[PDB]
Structure formats: C-alpha cells, structure tokens
Amino acid sequence: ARVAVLISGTGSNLQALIDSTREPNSSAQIDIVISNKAAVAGLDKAERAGIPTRVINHKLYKNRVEFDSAIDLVLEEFSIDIVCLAGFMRILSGPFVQKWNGKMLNIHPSLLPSFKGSNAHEQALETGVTVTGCTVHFVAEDVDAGQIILQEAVPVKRGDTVATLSERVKLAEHKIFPAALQLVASGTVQLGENGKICWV
Template sequence: MPLPYTLPRVGSGNEPLRIAVFISGGGSGLAALLKFQAETPRLHNTVLVISEDPNAGGQVFCEENDVTFVGIRLPNISDKSLRRLSHEEEIEVKLVEYDVELIVLSGYMRILTPNFVKKWKGRLVNIHPSLLPKYPGAHAHRDALADGATVSGCTVHLVDEGVDSGQILASEMVEVLPTDTLSDLQNRIKIIEHKLYPQIIDDLCSGKIQF
C-alpha cells in the first residue's frame, strides 16, 4: 500500500519554510517563484536550486537573487539503476546541508526513484502542463493537440511513486485554439503556470492546504 503524504510544517515569519527548487533548463518557473517571494515577506524562502546540468540557464536567476545553485551531474556509472541512486544520494547530501523542508520541481526532467519519493512524500511538489489525469508524461502539449483537445491547462500536484499521479492540489484551464502550434499552447499555459504555482506553494507553506 502506498505511503500517506506527510505535509511540511507551516512556515512562519521568523522561520520561513526552506525550499529547494529542482530545474533542468532555463528556469522560468524558478524566476516566477523568486519574484513572488521577493514581492512581500512570505512564509517560505528558496535556499537552494539543484540541477543535473551544471550549466543550466536557470542559474542566472540564482545569481540575481543570491540563492545557491548546485549542478550535480549524473555519475559515470554504467548500471542505470545504480547511477540514479548514486545521483540522488549526492542530492540528498545537499538537501541535508541546507536544511531543506520542501522540494519544488520546476521543469525538472528526471523521474525520481520511488526510494527518493518515499522520503519526501508530501514535501515534494510538481506542476504539470495538462489537466491531470489527462496527458501525463513528458509530451503533454503534443498529446493534447494530437487528441484534438479543446481545453488543456496545468495542474499542481504532490509527487507520488507514479508518473504525474499524485494528489492534485490545484489546476487551471486554458483554451486550446484551432490554430495552436505546440509552442503556442506551451507559451500560453506557461503564463498560467507562473501565476498558479507560486500561489499554491504559498498555500501549502501557510497551512491552507490540508487533507
């Protein structure tokens, strides 16, 4: 039976919840979260950004906001399972070092192992560019267009041992236009993601989300 979720503690002004953001690329979602946190005092603070790519473009936002960026390459191990476990062990060392309490996946393209998820279940959140449970996986926009969908959107959810199958926290709909290309749909949904995700993270850290 899957383990239940253990939500993070409620942050406070004196002790904001300590967040690590995992990214793989340009970090536009990271930038949106950092901007949200800078607008007014929040009950959470991004203390660490981790990527499997030491040259990930998103590190520029870390430099601008005085947030530690750590690039952790996949180790040179031929066995794929051992490689994943070893990589996550290196990540765990950094999470402990920075006293991280909540992990935010933001354009992180690696699938975490069940072992890692179990340790963080309820304190590991993701945003997916579809109205889950429709179109899970890495090609949500392509799948929505191929299916002739008239609506799509984005979904914030807790991460479980499956793929985009965890407890849904919030979603928002976006119309799919007849003329939409993949990039058209992606860009329009991304605008909504950058508004919805920081707000739901804020709700989670302030105790507004309970179940």
C-alpha cells in the same frame, strides 16, 4: 519554510517562484537551486537572485538511487522543508519520493488525469481538445499521479503548435505554482492522512 527548487533548463517557473517568495507575506524562502545540467539559464536567474546554486550530473558518479542521494545530501545540508520540481527532467526513485512524501511539488502542463508524460502539449494537440491547462500536485511514486493541489484551464486555439500553446499555458503555470507553494509552506494545505489533500 525552507525551499529547494530543482531545474533542468531556462527556469521560467523558477523565476516566478523567486519573485513570489520575495514578497513580504511569503511563507516560503528559496535557499538552494539544484540543476542536473550545467549550461542551463535557470542557474543564472538563481545566481542573479543571490541564491546558492549547485549542479549534479550523472556521468559524474554511479547509477540512479544514488543520484537522488547526492541531491538529498544538499537537501539535508540546507535544512530543506519543501522541494519544488520546476522542469526537472529526471524521474526520482521510490526511496527519495518516499522520504519527501507530502513535501515535494511538481508543475505539469496539462489538466492531470489527462496527458501524463513529458510531451503533454503534443498529446493535447494530437487528441484535439479545445481546453487544456496545467496542474500542481504532490509528487507520488507513480509519475504525474500524486494528489492535486491547484489547476487552471487554458484554451487551445485552432492552429496552435507546441510553441504557441506552451506559451499560453506558461502564463497559468506562473500563477498557480507560486500560489500552490504558498498554500503548502503556510500549512494551509497538506497531504493529510487519508492520502487526499486537506485544507485546514
């Protein structure tokens, strides 16, 4: 399966996916890395891995529903089968989410029905949970609500801050995102027909 990874920053999850898809038994290959920003460290990791890089900005064209079209163009260009959102700070439009339905994955820093949004760790800490974690799910039109593929629990320590908690959770993200990509790329897991995850 041909894969496109979309980023916005450092790209620690991108690197994990790079290392994983480089293994001999990987059913996925990363063919293109797209960023909505330009001075992101994620691009260097991509280039350092010999992966074509391509950046798309907003101040460079029109509104949104068109921004996704520019992305989708490069997607068709590289004959992509699966899309991985790795820290992409940009909500995709209904048409795009519709086209890649069941073919786009996202990694979220919480045990998903809980703490949807871009500040999951602050929410977790504010709420006082002693257990949080991360989730890999299929991207649906409604933010952080698509079908769940894998999840991993991570403890919250007393005195934790966004900095220390995110560091602990990232270790789990680097494990399940690559594993989840392999499950989908190999055909072991698919969105199914009844909308729910299916394990062939």
